[PDB]
Amino acid sequence: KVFGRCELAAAMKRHGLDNYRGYSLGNWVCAAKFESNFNTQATNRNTDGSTDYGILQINSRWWCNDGRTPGSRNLCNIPCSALLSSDITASVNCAKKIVSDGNGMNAWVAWRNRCKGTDVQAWIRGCRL
Ligand SMILES: NC(=[NH2+])NCCC[C@H](N)C(=O)O
Ligand SMILES: NC(=[NH2+])NCCC[C@H](N)C(=O)O
Ligand SMILES: [Cl-]
Ligand SMILES: [Cl-]
Ligand SMILES: [Cl-]
Ligand SMILES: [Cl-]
Ligand SMILES: [Cl-]
Ligand SMILES: [Cl-]
Ligand SMILES: [Cl-]
Ligand SMILES: [Cl-]
Numbered sequence: 001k002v003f004g005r006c007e008l009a010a011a012m013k014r015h016g017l018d019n020y021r022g023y024s025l026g027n028w029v030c031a032a033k034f035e036s037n038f039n040t041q042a043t044n045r046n047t048d049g050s051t052d053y054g055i056l057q058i059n060s061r062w063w064c065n066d067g068r069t070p071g072s073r074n075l076c077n078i079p080c081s082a083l084l085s086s087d088i089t090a091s092v093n094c095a096k097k098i099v100s101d102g103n104g105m106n107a108w109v110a111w112r113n114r115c116k117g118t119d120v121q122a123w124i125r126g127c128r129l
Helices: 005-014 025-036 080-084 089-100 109-114 120-124
Strands: 043-045 051-053
Touching: 005 025, 005 120, 025 109, 025 120, 051 080, 080 089
Parallel strands: none
Antiparallel strands: 043 051
């Protein structure tokens, strides 16, 4: 599944991400756009043998277990494969733990580089949520 912008905004609002840890909904939609292009199935391999999974590109070194990553911690207590569902529940629950862990949304490099600093409210504009 690839989400549309307003469809994803709607789903993330349903899951309680609007203002989660102080981050307005547009932050989360922008993060998904530049992390995964709204693609629930996307994966990306890294040089440290970890992999980024799903719509928020959650990484296997710290957050989920994929049975193939060195120095893994599985802080979200979830198999990485669960983050490749077309249903965003597991990714949101993991994201809430990541953003609460103490560095906010800076955890997402694409967000830090291509969303932070811009007017993120524009990502939910016209969605009439
Ligand atoms: N700023 C924009 N309008 N971006 C395009 C997003 C449109 C989105 N995929 C939708 O149908 O809701
Ligand atoms: N992604 C960045 N580093 N942006 C820096 C400047 C962004 C600019 N203030 C804006 O409204 O979008
Ligand atoms: Cl895509
Ligand atoms: Cl897995
Ligand atoms: Cl592993
Ligand atoms: Cl969903
Ligand atoms: Cl979950
Ligand atoms: Cl980036
Ligand atoms: Cl917003
Ligand atoms: Cl809203």
